[PDB]
Amino acid sequence: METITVPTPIKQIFSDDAFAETIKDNLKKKSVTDAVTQNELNSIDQIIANNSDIKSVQGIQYLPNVTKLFLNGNKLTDIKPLANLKNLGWLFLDENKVKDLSSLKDLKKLKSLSLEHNGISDINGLVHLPQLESLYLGNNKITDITVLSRLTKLDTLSLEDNQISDIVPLAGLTKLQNLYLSKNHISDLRALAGLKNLDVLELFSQECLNKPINHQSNLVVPNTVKNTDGSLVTPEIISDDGDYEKPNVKWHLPEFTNEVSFIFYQPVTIGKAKARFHGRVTQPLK
Amino acid sequence: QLPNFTAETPIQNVILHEHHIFLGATNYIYVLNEEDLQKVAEYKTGPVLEVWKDNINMALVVDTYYDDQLISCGSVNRGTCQRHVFPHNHSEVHCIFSPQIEEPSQCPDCVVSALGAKVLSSVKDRFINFFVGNTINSSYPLHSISVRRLKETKDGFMFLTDQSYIDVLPEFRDSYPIKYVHAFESNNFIYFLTVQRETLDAQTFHTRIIRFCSINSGLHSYMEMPLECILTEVFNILQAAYVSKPGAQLARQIGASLNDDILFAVFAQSKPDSAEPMDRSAMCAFPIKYVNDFFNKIRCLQHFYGPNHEHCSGCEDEYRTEFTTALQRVDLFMGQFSEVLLTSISTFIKGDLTIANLGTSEGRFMQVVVSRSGPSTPHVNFLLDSHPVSPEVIVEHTLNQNGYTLVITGKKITKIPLNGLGCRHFQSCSQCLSAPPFVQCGWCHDKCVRSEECLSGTWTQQICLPAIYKVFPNSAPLEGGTRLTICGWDFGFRRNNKFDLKKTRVLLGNESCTLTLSESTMNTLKCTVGFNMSIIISNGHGTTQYSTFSYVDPVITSISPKYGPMAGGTLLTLTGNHISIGGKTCTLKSVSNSILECYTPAQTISTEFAVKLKIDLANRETSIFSYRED
């Protein structure tokens, strides 16, 4: 619905100096003071503005035919301008601070979205994109993920480096293929038991924790880790004179320590993917 | 291109005493200069006379304790050692050899076996002890394992006890030998990594660690234990090993501290029932402290004592023991080197990264960032020469971390820096940012160069755009889902140092394309499709196009000959733009876009059949061919 009827300079359209220059270079223009028409704005299909220090994309509404956006490495904190870009296909807003992802609600032509490094806590807004085909929510603070249960089109999916403890929601995503669950708090694995179409997987470097236990001279905490079949993954390297007497890891702790740990390892193969489930379980002491 | 040096003969051992390299080679012991690999002095041990025999060096050891001196150990005179009293600031050579009036039954000065041996030096308790591992076959004095100390007179050696040495009994003398791969000192204990039988007469081979605390003349806690490198399939034969500290990153994945020793060891799955290694190499690290826990967990040794006799606590006549339960880790490289033979291993730390440079049975040298996570591509990879790299290497640390490993390849020992070969030797843009955090490169429009060395305003460490060189095929069937191979540069995303095809998407015209990521690389993209459209490729930053790909309609104009041999064997020619008639496939002779030649299947029929093209889309059954008896 956004249509400039009169020839207007690019400086006035996009209020942000950075994003204005971007469009300028895109349109082979001489300066931001050059006038532009709505026809010239319509023919803009792909903007490439990674690391442009762009703080706002106000004015993008006048580019209805934009289906490629690259804005990684910016200062973007709002995505209301994008809220009504009809044909937006690919979008990449990494290393920003976009959080009100609800602003994408009516982007039913969006395929590949990327929002890593955005300090995102909640992601529930994504429910309004059952058409998504490539999600990229790595490097964040995501806890719950039950939302993803409905993104049943994603053939790709990041999620590395968050705080995902429960991955069960991913269960029915059988149309998946490239899953990335590194750097999380993945204890269980029975969840992905059905991803019979996987091709690439990364279940690496989990950092699970257990609720604090009262330290004794003789301690025994049950193994929590589980494999894809539900078998107690056998602890690779235990710490502090720790031995694994299935299913309980036992310790001989004369004096008081703050915690014990046991790094594990257990290469798994799901469907057609061959990854290696690795991590470090830790137990508080008092 | 880099500092090199080659001798008259192959270099067996290398050591470095104060800005001077020492190369114990065949018939020679060269003395190079640390700065430029410049040969300064040398000593000719030469081809000695037993008959005439080559003097293959078997050990180099220097000790400035008494006085500054090198001690070489030949292979001709019962593996005897000789002294080398240094000049003053840099001839003059003695010889270690007394007589055995003590009793001729033994020979403390006959140090090294010519069939492989490793020697360690330590100044334990006022004296210079020598820890010797000898591989022995049937022949008449020469201990397989021995703690002979040196005398203050500096002209011979002397043991201290009946049990200051362990010897493989005569009946097992030649049967199943013990190849000594490497040895080191750690935590007051002495270790030896060896390849051998699994047990007495057992066909396949093994690999074990050996520990014993020594005092005066030790062997008091002697004790073997199996070491198995697996991935999720045993790699028995040990190929080389090196002991350093863990990079801060590696210290999280293996539970080791930053100052604890780590036993990096390149293994190798051996051939069927043999000790001959295949070109299939693994590798894993063994925290020395963790190794010292397996030993502290609770069967008689077959070769020292009698296999059929029965026999055998807390140590910072006292007999020796073996272990039934093998200590084992997993391949750290996930077996990235599954089809290559690794020969050398060296490990240093630059920050958190634990880079370890490797050698190959083909002279391939490479510095790979060690990590459980991803088997990072060697940011340094090339060929020294057709001669396989030697496990013998030196790791030297200088101020502000310059460093260099001395790698040997036959006769040529080259001086390679740890900082990598600069940024100049990087080929593509993606590869220019794949270099570690410390290198500080920056792809500059066309070439890769250092930071402030960018001629134009296109220097960056993130933005790498795609580029399509060529695609195969150039066309496709109407509905068919042909496979696509798209070769180019820069298809991976940047971060954590590594690059993957995560944010890699292919777009054919308007129809989104499906990538099989496993089969795709940073340069080779394999997609499966299904007009005169264009192809698009996004690597998360930008995209490229390629407007040759067409969706032509395969059609068969005419076919000749129209009739043929009842049996069948005539050349059938098709015209137009995976042939099989009557069901049972015929054969293709010459393919084209205009003409096809095929040999008809000798079918057991006498009727006519439709000729079916199956180019991903089963197409025209043009003019029917007729089998008829003449």
UniProtKB/Swiss-Prot annotation, chain A:
The residue intervals holding the LRR repeats read 41-63, 64-87, 89-107, 108-129, 130-153, 155-173, 174-197
State its location(s).
Secreted; Cytoplasm; Cell membrane
- Residues forming the LRRNT domain are 2-42
Q: Please list where the region (Ig-like region) is annotated.
A: 207-285
Query: Disruption effect?
Result: Deletion of inlB alone decreases host cell entry; the reduction varies from 99% to 37% depending on the cell line tested.
Give the LRRCT domain ranges.
207-286
Q: Superkingdom of the source?
A: Bacteria
Q: Which family does it belong to?
A: Belongs to the internalin family.
Q: What is known of its domains?
A: The N-terminus (36-79) resembles a truncated EF hand, the LRR region (80-240) has a curved form, while residues 241-321 form an Ig-like region; the whole region forms a curved tube. The LRR domain alone (31-241) binds mammalian MET and stimulates its Tyr-phosphorylation; the LRR plus Ig-like region (36-321) are required for receptor dimerization; adding the B-repeat allows the protein to scatter host cell colonies, and the GW domains, especially GW2 and GW3, potentiate MET activation.
The protein's assembly and partners: Interacts via its LRR repeats plus the Ig-like region with the extracellular portion (residues 25-741) of its receptor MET; MET can bind HGF, its endogenous ligand, and InlB simultaneously. Probably forms a dimer upon interaction with host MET, which subsequently allows dimerization of the host MET and subsequent host signaling; dimerization probably occurs via the convex surface of InlB. Prevention of dimerization does not block interaction with MET but prevents downstream action.
Described by its record, this protein's role is as follows: Mediates the entry of L.monocytogenes into normally non-phagocytic mammalian host cells. Its host receptor is hepatocyte growth factor receptor (HGF receptor, a tyrosine kinase, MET) which is tyrosine-phosphorylated in response to InlB. Downstream targets MAPK1/MAPK3 (Erk1/2) and AKT are phosphorylated in response to InlB, which also causes cell colony scattering. Complement component 1 Q subcomponent-binding protein (gC1q-R, C1QBP) has been suggested to also act an InlB receptor, but this is less certain.
Q: What is this protein called?
A: Internalin B
Q: What is the organism field in this record?
A: Listeria monocytogenes serovar 1/2a (strain ATCC BAA-679 / EGD-e)
Q: Which residues of the full protein are shown?
A: 36 to 320 of 630
UniProtKB/Swiss-Prot annotation, chain B:
Localization per record: Membrane
Residues annotated as glycosylated are: N4, N89, N137, T485, N510, N532, T573
Q: Which cysteines are joined by disulfide bonds?
A: C73-C81, C107-C110, C229-C284, C300-C312, C423-C441, C429-C464, C432-C448, C444-C454, C513-C527, C586-C598
Q: How is it modified after translation?
A: Dephosphorylated by PTPN1 and PTPN2.
General function of this protein? Receptor tyrosine kinase that transduces signals from the extracellular matrix into the cytoplasm by binding to hepatocyte growth factor/HGF ligand. Regulates many physiological processes including proliferation, scattering, morphogenesis and survival. Ligand binding at the cell surface induces autophosphorylation of MET on its intracellular domain that provides docking sites for downstream signaling molecules. Following activation by ligand, interacts with the PI3-kinase subunit PIK3R1, PLCG1, SRC, GRB2, STAT3 or the adapter GAB1. (Microbial infection) Acts as a receptor for Listeria monocytogenes internalin InlB, mediating entry of the pathogen into cells.
The family this protein is said to belong to: Belongs to the protein kinase superfamily. Tyr protein kinase family.
Q: Which disease is it linked to?
A: Activation of MET after rearrangement with the TPR gene produces an oncogenic protein. Defects in MET may be associated with gastric cancer.
User: Which protein is depicted?
Assistant: Hepatocyte growth factor receptor
Q: Specify the taxonomic lineage.
A: Eukaryota, Metazoa, Chordata, Craniata, Vertebrata
Residues shown, of full length? 42 to 740 of 1390
